[model samples]
Structures are given as C-alpha cells and as structure tokens.
Target: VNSFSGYLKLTDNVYIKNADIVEEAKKVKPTVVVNAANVYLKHGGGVAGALNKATNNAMQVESDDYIATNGPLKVGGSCVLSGHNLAKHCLHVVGPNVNKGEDIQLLKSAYENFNQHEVLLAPLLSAGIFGADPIHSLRVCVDTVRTNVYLAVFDKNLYDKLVSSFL
Candidate 1:
C-alpha cells in the first residue's frame, strides 16, 4: 500500500503521517484510533464512515448504544469503546463547532482525550464540515496531544500544507 514519509515528529509525543488512516489502523494496531467526532457520533461521513465500514457497522452499533444510554455527547465529550475488529480500542471525541462560535478550549479538550496508550492515531479535529481552519487544527493537535499521537493526513493539499508549516 502507498504510504507517506512517516515517523515525522511534531512534538515529543505527536507525529504526522501522510496516509489514509483507515488503512493505517489495520496495520499499526494502535491502542486507539481516535475519531474527531461530532456530538451525535453518528457515522455520517468523513473518517467516521470509513472506520465504521471497515469495522462492519459494529462501531456504529456502539455509538448508538452510547447515545441510547447517555444522550448526545457534548462538545469536548469523549468515550472509548471496543474497536469492533480493528485496533483494540476506539475513542470518539466531540470537538467544538466553529459555526456555533465555540472556541479552542472545547477543541483542545476533545483532542487531549487520551488513554494510557503508547500509540494513537487521529484526524485533525474540527477541520472538516465543522469549519475550523486546518492550521488551527494542526496547531492544536501538535501542541496539546500528550501521547504518541499520529495526525493522519489523507489529502494531498493537507499533506503539503502540513509539510509547509513544519518547515
């Protein structure tokens, strides 16, 4: 499978890899594949859809179960569940919505939700339909992540931008 130059460090424990994370999750066996998720945690689209598909909808079932029991997840709220079939665990974190004027604290809270895992993989939270600028997402992921985090960049434009900023 095609992959990018990985093992590139953004901070002491954070790294960036230019690759599709769905494929990466199966290979790396990360302790948790963190999802930069929404309040509903519905596998609507983006990385959520791919992960859900790969897991054969078991991930979606877990999300539904969580909502049924606890209600909609709030901004900065997070929960971890069995990985269904891929990695051992999966973490869904709801970041602040820029459209609603929510700011960095909420996003940071979502991004910083880590377990005692040595390896993690997550998307750039709030950077898609949530309308957060990719730059801020990159900065937050780089600055706040405390574990061995991997920022998976799937888009060519995003990868180039990340490299530009790193330089």
Candidate 2:
C-alpha cells in the first residue's frame, strides 16, 4: 500500500487512504484537520483529545467561545479553529454518538460546515470508540469533500477493510 496515496476515489478528486493522519497532514501543509466532537468541543478523548494537547488547548478555548454564542452544535454541524501546530486550520465536527445508519448524512452535514480549501485531513468519523462503520464513514467523507479528501486510518483491520471494499 502506498502510504501517501489513496486506495479509492469517491469522487473526482476525493479519495480514501490508509496512513497516519498527522503525518499526512504535515505533508499536505495547508491541510485542515476535521475533529469529531460535540458543539462544546471538549476534545476530551480520541483524536480530539490528542489535538487539544497538541494545540495547547487553544482549540477547546475557541470552541467555548463559538458554542456560547451559536449554541450547542447538533450532529452534522461543525466549527473551524486555528491549527496551532498540527495544521493550518482545524474543523471540529459534531457527530452522532451511536451508529443509527445516519453516519453518511451526518458526515455530509459536517463537511458542509467548513470553509473551502485544497486539502482536508480527516479520520473515520464516529468509528472506533464512537461505534460508526469505518467503511460507511469514509464514503461519506469522500462523497462530501469531493476534492482532495485524505483519510487516515490507524487500525490495520480498518485499513484492510477499506482497501478491500474499494480496491
């Protein structure tokens, strides 16, 4: 598998790849990270937690301000923050807690929340700890972005599944 290349194409330029998200993000340089979280933007665990510490908790602080005025973000909503050290910017997306088979709709909505950019670095939304289907979530991401969508999957099994399903 090419660590820097995508195995599947959901659209013209959108693709799914198996690689370390942060590493690929660094390569993209101007990439914006998509965070899976609630409107509060707690960054308590998972990739969000890792980013919170990486950004010196600045993401959380910004989220606090954004949510205060706009109200709690529902599932499929998102917010963008400055990516202190990890990326050029961050896109915090509120996702459903459980897999109700609406991951695609919610992910599509989440992708709509961010600004237009050349590259986007995102993980499998609502999967793993959140219990969302990895394959379905990736499809949603690729379909929504439609341009230069780089997906990062850490698990070997998930990676294999994605490749097998698409390639």
Candidate 1 per-residue C-alpha lDDT over 87-140 given as tens digits, one digit per residue, 9 for 90 to 100: 889888888878878876777777768635566778888877677887788887
Where's the lowest-lDDT run of ten residues in candidate 1? Answer: 1-10
lDDT (Cα, tens digit) per residue for candidate 2, span 129-155: 667777777666655665566667877
Q: Per-candidate RMSD vs. true structure? A: 3.1, 3.7
Off by over 4 Å in 2: 1-11, 99-104
TM-score of each: 0.88, 0.79
Candidate 2: residue 89 lDDT (0-100): 84
**Cα RMSD, model 2:** 3.7
Which consecutive 10 residues in model 2 have the weakest lDDT in total? Answer: 1-10
Report backbone clashes per prediction.
0, 0
